[PDB]
Amino acid sequence: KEKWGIAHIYSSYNNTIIHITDITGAETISRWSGGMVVKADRDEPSPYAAMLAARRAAEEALEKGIVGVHIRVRAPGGSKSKTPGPGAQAAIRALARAGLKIGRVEDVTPIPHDGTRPKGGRRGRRV
RNA sequence: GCUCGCUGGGGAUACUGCGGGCCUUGGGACCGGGAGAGGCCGGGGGUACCCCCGGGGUAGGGGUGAAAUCCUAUAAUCCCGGG
Ligand SMILES: [Mg+2]
Ligand SMILES: [Mg+2]
Ligand SMILES: [Mg+2]
C-alpha cells in the first residue's frame, strides 16, 4: 500500500541531525548529520549543510521503499535553548524536493514546568 | 532697680491637679454574607533532567570569536520499550 515513516530533525546552534525511522519509531532507516557532509566546524549548522544531509538521507530512504514522512522538529530544549537553529526549515524543504511526500509537521521541543537550573551562574556568560 | 528667691495672712475659680456623678464620638468585644501565593501538618500529581538495563544503527558527538582538552569501535551522539 503506502509505507510512511518519521523524520526526526534535531537543530541547535552548533549542528543539525536528520534521522529517518519507520512509523513506529523503533527501526532506523537513515541518519545523517552536518559533520558528515562538510569539513569545517563553522559550517555544521549552516542551511546548506542541512540541505546536503537531507538529500543524502532522502535518497537512502527512497531506495528502501519509504514513500512519505511525518516531520518532528526539535531544539535542544530542557535547560538549554528553546529556539531551533537556522537549519530546520532548510532541512524541511530539501526533503520534499528530493521526492518524499510530506505529512503533518509539528515541533516536539521538551519544555519544563519549572525544572532544572541552567549553567553559567547568576550572572551568565560574560563576553 | 539688683540678689527672680523665701515666708504670714485675705480674695477669685477660667485652665491644669485631686474627689464624686453622667455619657459615646477614640479604642476594644460580638454577630452576618463574602476576599486573599498569610502560616503549619498529612495525602496525591506535573513536565523536565540524570543514571541503569534491553532493541535499532554506524562514525562521529560536544564546544568556541576561532580552537583544544573532554566523550566515542567495551558501539557514542540520535530514535524506541522499561526500571
Ligand atoms: Mg562535527
Ligand atoms: Mg573580552
Ligand atoms: Mg543499546
UniProtKB/Swiss-Prot annotation:
Located on the platform of the 30S subunit. The gene is rps11. GO terms for biological process: translation. Residues 106-127 are annotated as: Disordered. Keywords: Ribonucleoprotein, Ribosomal protein, RNA-binding, rRNA-binding. It comes from Pyrococcus abyssi (strain GE5 / Orsay). Part of the 30S ribosomal subunit. This is Small ribosomal subunit protein uS11. NCBIfam families: arch_S11P, PRK09607.1. One of its GO terms (molecular function) is structural constituent of ribosome. Belongs to the universal ribosomal protein uS11 family. One of its GO terms (cellular component) is ribosome.
